Scaffold this active site. Sequence first.
Site, PDB file in Angstrom:
ATOM      1  N   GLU C 108      -1.995  -7.088  12.223  1.00 59.06           N
ATOM      2  CA  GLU C 108      -0.993  -6.650  11.293  1.00 59.06           C
ATOM      3  C   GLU C 108      -1.458  -6.563   9.849  1.00 59.06           C
ATOM      4  O   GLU C 108      -2.423  -7.211   9.445  1.00 59.06           O
ATOM      5  CB  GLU C 108       0.193  -7.651  11.420  1.00 59.06           C
ATOM      6  CG  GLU C 108       1.383  -7.452  10.537  1.00 59.06           C
ATOM      7  CD  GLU C 108       2.149  -6.147  10.786  1.00 59.06           C
ATOM      8  OE1 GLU C 108       3.309  -6.242  11.247  1.00 59.06           O
ATOM      9  OE2 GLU C 108       1.600  -5.045  10.541  1.00 59.06           O
ATOM     10  N   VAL C 162       3.012  -4.364  -2.972  1.00 54.57           N
ATOM     11  CA  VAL C 162       1.610  -3.963  -3.164  1.00 54.57           C
ATOM     12  C   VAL C 162       1.261  -2.739  -2.318  1.00 54.57           C
ATOM     13  O   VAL C 162       2.003  -2.421  -1.391  1.00 54.57           O
ATOM     14  CB  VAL C 162       0.678  -5.109  -2.790  1.00 54.57           C
ATOM     15  CG1 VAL C 162       1.012  -6.365  -3.633  1.00 54.57           C
ATOM     16  CG2 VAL C 162       0.795  -5.444  -1.292  1.00 54.57           C
ATOM     17  N   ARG C 174      -2.620   4.527   1.125  1.00 55.04           N
ATOM     18  CA  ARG C 174      -3.148   3.782   2.251  1.00 55.04           C
ATOM     19  C   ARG C 174      -4.685   3.750   2.260  1.00 55.04           C
ATOM     20  O   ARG C 174      -5.279   2.768   2.695  1.00 55.04           O
ATOM     21  CB  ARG C 174      -2.644   4.332   3.591  1.00 55.04           C
ATOM     22  CG  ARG C 174      -1.133   4.250   3.800  1.00 55.04           C
ATOM     23  CD  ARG C 174      -0.797   4.626   5.227  1.00 55.04           C
ATOM     24  NE  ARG C 174       0.619   4.907   5.476  1.00 55.04           N
ATOM     25  CZ  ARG C 174       1.531   4.016   5.877  1.00 55.04           C
ATOM     26  NH1 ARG C 174       1.239   2.724   6.014  1.00 55.04           N
ATOM     27  NH2 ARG C 174       2.777   4.399   6.070  1.00 55.04           N
TER      28      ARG C 174
HETATM   29  N1  LIG Z   1       3.466  -1.061   1.184  1.00 52.61           N
HETATM   30  C1  LIG Z   1       4.010  -2.287   1.328  1.00 52.61           C
HETATM   31  N2  LIG Z   1       4.711  -2.544   2.459  1.00 52.61           N
HETATM   32  C2  LIG Z   1       5.274  -3.766   2.627  1.00 52.61           C
HETATM   33  C3  LIG Z   1       5.133  -4.737   1.647  1.00 52.61           C
HETATM   34  N3  LIG Z   1       5.777  -5.842   2.074  1.00 52.61           N
HETATM   35  C4  LIG Z   1       6.315  -5.560   3.278  1.00 52.61           C
HETATM   36  N4  LIG Z   1       5.997  -4.298   3.614  1.00 52.61           N
HETATM   37  C5  LIG Z   1       6.399  -3.590   4.855  1.00 52.61           C
HETATM   38  O1  LIG Z   1       7.135  -4.467   5.717  1.00 52.61           O
HETATM   39  C6  LIG Z   1       6.423  -4.706   6.944  1.00 52.61           C
HETATM   40  C7  LIG Z   1       6.575  -6.168   7.332  1.00 52.61           C
HETATM   41  O2  LIG Z   1       7.945  -6.485   7.142  1.00 52.61           O
HETATM   42  P1  LIG Z   1       8.667  -7.501   8.142  1.00 52.61           P
HETATM   43  O3  LIG Z   1       8.976  -6.662   9.350  1.00 52.61           O
HETATM   44  O4  LIG Z   1       7.643  -8.606   8.362  1.00 52.61           O
HETATM   45  O5  LIG Z   1       9.864  -7.934   7.324  1.00 52.61           O
HETATM   46  C8  LIG Z   1       4.988  -4.288   6.674  1.00 52.61           C
HETATM   47  O6  LIG Z   1       4.291  -3.850   7.835  1.00 52.61           O
HETATM   48  C9  LIG Z   1       5.157  -3.189   5.640  1.00 52.61           C
HETATM   49  O7  LIG Z   1       5.429  -1.972   6.286  1.00 52.61           O
HETATM   50  C10 LIG Z   1       4.391  -4.449   0.502  1.00 52.61           C
HETATM   51  O8  LIG Z   1       4.242  -5.344  -0.379  1.00 52.61           O
HETATM   52  N5  LIG Z   1       3.839  -3.225   0.378  1.00 52.61           N
END
Ligand SMILES: Nc1nc2c(ncn2[C@@H]2O[C@H](COP(=O)(O)O)[C@@H](O)[C@H]2O)c(=O)[nH]1
Lengths: 180, 201, 189, 180
Positions: C108, C162, C174
Site C-alpha cells: 500500500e 502529500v 504520481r
Molecule cells: N494523494 C494523497 N492521497 C491520500 C493521502 N492520504 C490519504 N490518501 C488516500 O486515502 C487512501 C487511504 O485512505 P484510507 O482508506 O486508509 O482512509 C490512500 O490510498 C490515498 O488514496 C495523501 O496525503 N495524499
Amino acid sequence: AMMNQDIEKVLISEEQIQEKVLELGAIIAEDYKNTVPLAIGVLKGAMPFMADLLKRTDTYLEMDFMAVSSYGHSTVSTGEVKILKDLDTSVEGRDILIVEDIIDSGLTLSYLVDLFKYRKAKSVKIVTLLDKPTGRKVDLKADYVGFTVPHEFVVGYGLDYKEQYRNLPYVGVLKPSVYS
Amino acid sequence: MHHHHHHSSGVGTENLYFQSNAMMNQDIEKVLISEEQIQEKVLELGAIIAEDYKNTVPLAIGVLKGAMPFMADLLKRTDTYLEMDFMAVSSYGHSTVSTGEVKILKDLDTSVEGRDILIVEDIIDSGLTLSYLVDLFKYRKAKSVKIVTLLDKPTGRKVDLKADYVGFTVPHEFVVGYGLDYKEQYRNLPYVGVLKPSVYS
Amino acid sequence: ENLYFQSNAMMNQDIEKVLISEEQIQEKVLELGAIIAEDYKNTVPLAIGVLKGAMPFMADLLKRTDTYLEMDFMAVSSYGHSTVSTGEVKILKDLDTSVEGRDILIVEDIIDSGLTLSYLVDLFKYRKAKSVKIVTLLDKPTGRKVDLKADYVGFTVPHEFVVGYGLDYKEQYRNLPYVGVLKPSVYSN
Amino acid sequence: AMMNQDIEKVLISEEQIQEKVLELGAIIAEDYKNTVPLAIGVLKGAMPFMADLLKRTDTYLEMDFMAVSSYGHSTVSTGEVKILKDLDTSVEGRDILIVEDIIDSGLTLSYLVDLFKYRKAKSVKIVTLLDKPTGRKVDLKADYVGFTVPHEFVVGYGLDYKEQYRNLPYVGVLKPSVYS
Ligand SMILES: Nc1nc2c(ncn2[C@@H]2O[C@H](COP(=O)(O)O)[C@@H](O)[C@H]2O)c(=O)[nH]1
Ligand SMILES: Nc1nc2c(ncn2[C@@H]2O[C@H](COP(=O)(O)O)[C@@H](O)[C@H]2O)c(=O)[nH]1
Ligand SMILES: OC[C@H]1O[C@@](CO)(O[C@H]2O[C@H](CO)[C@@H](O)[C@H](O)[C@H]2O)[C@@H](O)[C@@H]1O
Ligand SMILES: OC[C@H]1O[C@@](CO)(O[C@H]2O[C@H](CO)[C@@H](O)[C@H](O)[C@H]2O)[C@@H](O)[C@@H]1O
Ligand SMILES: OC[C@H]1O[C@@](CO)(O[C@H]2O[C@H](CO)[C@@H](O)[C@H](O)[C@H]2O)[C@@H](O)[C@@H]1O
Ligand SMILES: [Mg+2]
Ligand SMILES: [Mg+2]
C-alpha cells in the site's frame, strides 16, 4: 403500498409485449437459421426482454452479456463507456445480435456496435424492445423493433426509476409524485 | 520445503513446490541487462519522453502485470505532468494467439477520447495483442497513441508494429526479471536475466 | 473543447517542500525488502498491490526483496455510504489467482482511515488465506476509523495532504520520485 | 436441424415452469413485502428464470448481477471464484435474494452467500429453479425451490451444453449423440 399504485398508465400491456416478442423471435429465428449468432445484452435493462425474446427464438444461439459504466462527458458526446465486463468469448468472425430495452440517443449503443466491428464481427444487428427515434444524437437504426415510443419516461419490463420497477410485466408511466 | 498452487489459463491449475533454500539467482544462467544498465536507460528515455510530451498531459498506461516495474522506474524519470492508468486483459484462447483480440478485465478509469496515450510495455514479440490495444485506443478517438517498451524482439512480429521507444533489443534468449516471469516467478528481479534451460525443460 | 497550458511549468515549482526525498525512500525500501525477504524465506507469497497509488512503491520494494514471490493487483471503487463507513468497495479487478492457502502481502501507499484496507484484509481471510500482512510506505495513524496496524511501515507522516511516488492531486504528480507537499496556491478544488 | 431434434426428452415443460414461477413469485412477493430486497442473478444461466420469476413478483425490488470465473482447483474445492463483475451497489444492510438456475455441489453459491454475509448483508436467501441435493459438496439448502432433480445433465431455460440450448423455453435431456 403496491407498484401498480405508482403507475399512471400502462402504455404497453404484458399481452402486447408477449405477442410482439413471439413475432420478433420467429423473425430472428428465420434470419439466423444457418449460423449460431452471439446474442448479447447490456446489463441491466435488456435482461427481461432478452430472456423472453430468446426463449421464443427457435434456433441455435449463444448468449452473452456486457456491463459498462459512464465516463461522464465523453459518454454524453461520443458514447464511449468503460467496459466493466467484456464478453466471455471472442467477437471476430461471429454474427452479433445486440438485444436492447430502449434506444434513445443511440450514442453508447453506436459505440458498442462499432467496437464489435473494430473487433471484426462478421455482422452486427440490433433488436430493441422500444425505440425512440426522435431522441437520436447519432445515426443508428435498429434492425428489429418491438415498439416505437414518443418519450423515454417509462418504467417496467427492464426499465427502472431509481433501480426499481424493472420487474413490472408491462411498460408504464409513473405518476408525477413518484419522481417529483 | 514449501508449495502452493496458482491459476493458469492454459491447463487450469499449477502446483508449485519449492525447497527451503532455493534462491532466484541460482536459476539465472547469466545477467543480460544489469540494473545499472536499466537505470541508465530509463533515465535517458524519461528525459526524451519528457521533452516529447512537454506540451500535453499524456495518459501513460501499463498493461498488467509485466510492465509494472519498468513503468514505475521510467515514469519517475519522466519530469513532466502526466496521468497514470492501467489495463488488465485475458486471452480468449486460440483466437487471441492468432488475432490479438483479448478480453478486457480492467478497462481504463478515464476516457480515451482526445488524449495522447503512451502505452508502457515490458516486451513486444508477436505484437498482436498490443496492436489490438493500440487500434482500440484509436477507435476510441485518442489524439495519439505511442508505445514505450523495455525490451523488443522485432523479428518475432506477426503484425506490423514499430514501438516509438525501446530500451533494449533482445536476441535469441528466454529472459525473466524486471516484470517478466516464468510460471509467475522472477518478476521481482531488479535485472533481466537468462533463465537456465533446466528450469524451463 | 479542452485547451492545456503548461508553458515551461515544472512540477517542482508546485512543491513547497520535499518531505521524503528519493534517497530517503530508497534506503527505507532497501531495509524493508531485506526484512520481508527474511520473513518470507519459507514461502512464496502473493504480493498484491492496490491500484493506482501503490505501484511505484511496490515496484521498488519487490526489486529489493530477494525471494520467490508472485505479484498481483486489484482495482476497487467506492460505493459512497458503506465505503465511507465500513470500507466495503466494489471489486473492479479481482486477483488473477486464488487466495486459498496463500500468504498474502498487501502493498500500500498510505493508510489513513484504514477502512478499505481492513475490508480487504478480512476479505482475504474469508477467502482462506494462510496469512495476510500489510506493508505500507506511509502511515497516518492518527486518522484511523478502525483498529488496523500495518505489519511493515516505511515512514509515519502527520495528518497532512502529500503527493508524489504514486500519490496524486487530481491524477497528477504520481510520477514524482519523492513525496512532497504542495504549495497552497496550487490546490484549487 | 432444429434444437428439439437434439432433445431426447422434455423433463419439465414450459407450462410446468410457468406455473411454478407464478407460485414462487407470489411467495417471494409476500415474504419481501416490507423492504425492497436486492435480487441478484449470477450470469449466465440464471437469467431466464430470474427475468420470469421477478416479473411474477409483485413487490418493490432492485435487480443486480454478478459475473464470476473459475480459478481452477480452489473453485472446485472451496467455491472461491474470481469476481469479474461485482454488484452495482453495496451489500451492507440489504436483504439479498440470489436467483439460481441449478444448485448441485453448491460450492460457489455457498462462497457467494458467505461473501455477502462477510459484506454485512441483513439476510441472504436463495431461490433456485432446479435443485440436486444428492450432488452437494457443502451443506447449502435453498430457501425456495422450483423442482428437485436427480441429476444435472440437462439443458434449457438457461442451462447450456457448450454455450447452446440456454434459450429453450423448457428443460430437457440431450440425446447421447449430441455429446458423443
Ligand atoms: N494523494 C494523497 N492521497 C491520500 C493521502 N492520504 C490519504 N490518501 C488516500 O486515502 C487512501 C487511504 O485512505 P484510507 O482508506 O486508509 O482512509 C490512500 O490510498 C490515498 O488514496 C495523501 O496525503 N495524499
Ligand atoms: N518472460 C518472457 N516472456 C517472453 C519472452 N519473449 C516473449 N515473451 C512473452 O511475450 C508476451 C508479449 O509478447 P507478444 O504478445 O507481443 O508476443 C509477454 O507477456 C512475454 O511474456 C521472454 O524472453 N521472456
Ligand atoms: O402509444 C402508442 C402509439 O404509437 C403508435 C404511433 O406511433 O404506434 C406506432 O408504433 C407501432 C409499433 O410498430 C406501429 O405499429 C404504428 O404504426 C406506429 O404508429 C400508435 O399506435 C399509438 O398511438
Ligand atoms: O533516442 C535514443 C533512444 O532510442 C532508443 C530506441 O527508442 O535506442 C535507439 O537509439 C540508440 C542510440 O541513439 C541506439 O543505440 C539503439 O540501438 C536504438 O534502438 C532508446 O533505447 C534510446 O533511449
Ligand atoms: O421432473 C420432476 C421430478 O422431480 C421429482 C423428484 O425428482 O419431484 C420433484 O418435483 C416436485 C414438483 O415440483 C416437487 O414438489 C418435489 O419436491 C420434487 O421431489 C419427481 O417426482 C419427478 O420425476
Ligand atoms: Mg500478443
Ligand atoms: Mg478507506
